[PDB]
Amino acid sequence: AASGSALIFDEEMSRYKLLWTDPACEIEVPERLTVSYEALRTHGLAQRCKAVPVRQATEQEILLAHSEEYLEAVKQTPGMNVEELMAFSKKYNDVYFHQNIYHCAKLAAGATLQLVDSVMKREVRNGMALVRPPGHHSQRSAANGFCVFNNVAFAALYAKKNYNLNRILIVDWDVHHGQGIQYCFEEDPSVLYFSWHRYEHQSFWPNLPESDYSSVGKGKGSGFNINLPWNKVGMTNSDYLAAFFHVLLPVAYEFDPELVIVSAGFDSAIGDPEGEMCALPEIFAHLTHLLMPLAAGKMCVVLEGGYNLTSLGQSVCQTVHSLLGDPTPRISGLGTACDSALESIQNVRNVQSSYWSSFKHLAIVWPEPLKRMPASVRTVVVPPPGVELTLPKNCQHSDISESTAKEVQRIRDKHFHDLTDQNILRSLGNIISVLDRMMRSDEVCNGCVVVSDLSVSVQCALQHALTEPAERVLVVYVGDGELPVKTNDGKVFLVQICTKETEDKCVNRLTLCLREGESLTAGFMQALLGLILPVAYEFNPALVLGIVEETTRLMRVWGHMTCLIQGLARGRMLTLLQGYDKDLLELTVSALSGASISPLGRAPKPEDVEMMEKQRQRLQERWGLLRCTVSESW
Ligand SMILES: [N][C][C][C][N][C][C][C][C][C][B+]([O])([O])[O]
Ligand SMILES: [K+]
Numbered sequence: 364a365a366s367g368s369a370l371i372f373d374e375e376m377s378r379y380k381l382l383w384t385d386p387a388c389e390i391e392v393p394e395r396l397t398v399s400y401e402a403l404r405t406h407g408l409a410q411r412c413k414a415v416p417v418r419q420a421t422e423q424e425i426l427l428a429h430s431e432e433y434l435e436a437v438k439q440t441p442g443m444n445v446e447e448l449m450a451f452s453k454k455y456n457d458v459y460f461h462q463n464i465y466h467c468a469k470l471a472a473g474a475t476l477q478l479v480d481s482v483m484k485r486e487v488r489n490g491m492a493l494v495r496p497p498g499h500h501s502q503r504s505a506a507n508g509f510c511v512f513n514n515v516a517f518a519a520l521y522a523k524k525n526y527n528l529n530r531i532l533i534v535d536w537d538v539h540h541g542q543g544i545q546y547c548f549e550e551d552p553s554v555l556y557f558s559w560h561r562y563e564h565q566s567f568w569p570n571l572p573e574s575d576y577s578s579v580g581k582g583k584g585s586g587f588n589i590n591l592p593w594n595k596v597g598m599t600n601s602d603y604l605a606a607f608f609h610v611l612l613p614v615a616y617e618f619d620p621e622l623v624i625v626s627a628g629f630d631s632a633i634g635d636p637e638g639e640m641c642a643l644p645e646i647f648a649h650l651t652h653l654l655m656p657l658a659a660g661k662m663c664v665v666l667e668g669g670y671n672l673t674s675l676g677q678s679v680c681q682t683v684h685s686l687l688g689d690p691t692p693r694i695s696g697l698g699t700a701c702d703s704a705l706e707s708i709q710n711v712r713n714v715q716s717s718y719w720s721s722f723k724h725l726a727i728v729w730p731e732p733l734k735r736m737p738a739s740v741r742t743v744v745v746p747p748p749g750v751e752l753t754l755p756k757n758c759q760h761s762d763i764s765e766s767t768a769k770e771v772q773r774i775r776d777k778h779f780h781d782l783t784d785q786n787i788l789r790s791l792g793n794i795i796s797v798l799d800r801m802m803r804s805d806e807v808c809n810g811c812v813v814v815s816d817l818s819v820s821v822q823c824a825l826q827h828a829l830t831e832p833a834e835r836v837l838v839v840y841v842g843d844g845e846l847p848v849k850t851n852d853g854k855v856f857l858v859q860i861c862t863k864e865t866e867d868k869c870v871n872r873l874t875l876c877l878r879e880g881e882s883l884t885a886g887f888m889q890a891l892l893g894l895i896l897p898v899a900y901e902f903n904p905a906l907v908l909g910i911v912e913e914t915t916r917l918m919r920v921w922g923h924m925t926c927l928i929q930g931l932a933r934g935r936m937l938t939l940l941q942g943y944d945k946d947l948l949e950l951t952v953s954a955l956s957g958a959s960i961s962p963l964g965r966a967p968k969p970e971d972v973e974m975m976e977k978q979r980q981r982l983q984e985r986w987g988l989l990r991c992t993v994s995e996s997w
């Protein structure tokens with residue numbers, strides 16, 4: 364029922380700045396705020412987001428994560444001259460104070476709480492706050508690393524108290540370690556904290572042993588703190604997505620959070636002087652997109668770092684774009700993570716194996732991003748004739764025109780001479796016309812068509828896709844038969860989920876024979892996050908073809924599959940379901956349209972996880988993004 368996204372911002376938070384020479388804080392400028400908000404307005408994104416006003420965080424809220432002694436000291440900074448602010452700032456590590464910074468710090472915190480209440484009251488689906496100062500270095504009795512009050516720490520504690528939540532996920536993709544957040548929830552198993560960060564074997568600020576992968580949390584909350592230390596600069600999109608597919612997402616989906624909060628620092632993006640990483644601004648479109656199936660989309664993005672003003676504006680727009688549900692950009696050039704990334708991926712999964720099921724079995728210029736825009740109508744639905752269905756506001760039906768109708772006639776005489784059934788012939792007329800509207804017309808994004816004959820339906824859908832043209836087509840098929848899909852020219856990759864064990868010799872095919880049982884859904888999510896998504900992302904298809912046979916435990920997982928796989932091919936996925944299932948049809952259309960996805964809530968069987976790692980053994984040499992260990996030098 365929730366809909367819309369909140370952009371919380373105020374130009375007042377850009378009215379404090381550094382007043383003395385200090386190279387350790389020159390980069391933290393108020394223009395960070397003004398540049399990103401105007402980039403949002405230039406690209407029409409701010410106008411599409413509900414503008415919730417900012418608040419001052421009350422004293423009682425500040426005390427949720429900070430001591431009275433520290434709050435009292437900061438409260439005295441508006442009365443200091445610059446000499447007294449200099450002396451106050453040198454008592455902390457890499458942070459300056461301003462006559463207005465206490466004022467803005469309360470606003471940055473209140474803005475985060477305004478976002479939390481807007482999302483938890485269902486007044487919006489999600490949102491982002493553009494705050495300054497940052498927060499994730501702030502500690503209970505200390506300002507640290509440009510941070511005065513831990514904004515993200517407030518949101519989790521605030522959401523814990525006023526909405527009695529049991530599970531909150533904090534994802535810190537800033538290039539720095541959010542040690543303030545880790546310290547505050549170290550023993551809290553209700554707030555699962557994840558942060559990747561430039562570590563460089565503890566030689567990069569803040570130079571803490573606790574920033575390493577060793578720190579899994581303390582006491583009752585052990586295994587609820589996950590650090591992924593980057594030990595080399597120049598991390599790429601492949602490293603960031605390997606981090607998601609093989610660490611964060613497996614843990615995040617077993618945790619099943621009731622709310623997601625993102626410490627969104629964009630100093631991890633290309634060209635940032637502080638992070639010195641190499642991920643493109645488009646990567647945050649996918650980091651955002653891959654998280655939105657969690658907690659029914661309840662996601663609050665809070666700004667932290669990001670200092671290259673061009674790199675910063677581009678990354679902000681890519682995040683709000685995916686927040687609004689716009690199609691994701693195709694990511695080209697994906698491959699294996701570097702050896703150093705694979706080394707830290709390896710170590711985190713090993714130490715976390717005591718706590719998380721998906722691991723237990725182990726025991727400077729760049730191009731400007733292409734324009735992103737929602738389709739005129741996102742999803743087109745073709746139910747059987749005479750079946751009227753209630754459809755969301757961005758979903759239509761079908762009206763085959765003369766030229767499309769002649770194409771099915773040409774196809775019939777060539778490959779289907781005996782095909783006389785006029786019901787199949789209408790399905791092929793729709794398949795072509797919606798594919799025509801998805802690929803070339805750009806007015807439609809995706810679509811879903813109910814079919815009668817599976818064999819004929821797949822050929823026309825796939826063959827008409829390749830000549831339109833579609834450089835690559837990923838085919839995801841839930842069924843047991845064989846399909847008219849040739850997988851040798853490197854143009855097609857086939858994912859098959861079946862009930863019969865089968866051997867695969869082609870390295871462009873991935874068959875998963877998952878054991879039938881209660882285990883089915885937990886094992887499917889592991890193969891989705893750890894095998895299907897990494898391969899599909901490296902493949903970079905131009906189109907996704909979903910096929911479901913009539914012979915039903917797909918209901919639980921098919922929604923997240925449809926939502927997550929829409930990160931590929933700019934979200935242009937056409938689904939063919941054999942036979943009419945009102946619930947199944949309404950589920951895919953709901954997921955294809957960009958609606959909220961209902962959550963899941965065990966652990967899989969070793970018979971299945973072994974089948975999956977053998978698939979990984981068989982394919983990771985070709986598809987390096989599958990790798991979760993360092994390759995062995997011969
Ligand atoms: N170029 C010199 C900066 C060095 N001082 C530490 C940076 C703290 C980072 C804060 B944040 O990016 O997490 O917001
Ligand atoms: K981080």
Ligand SMILES: [K+]
Nearest residue numbers: 548551554587
């Ligand atoms: K924790």
Ligand SMILES: [Zn+2]
Nearest residue numbers: 537539628668
């Ligand atoms: Zn940072």
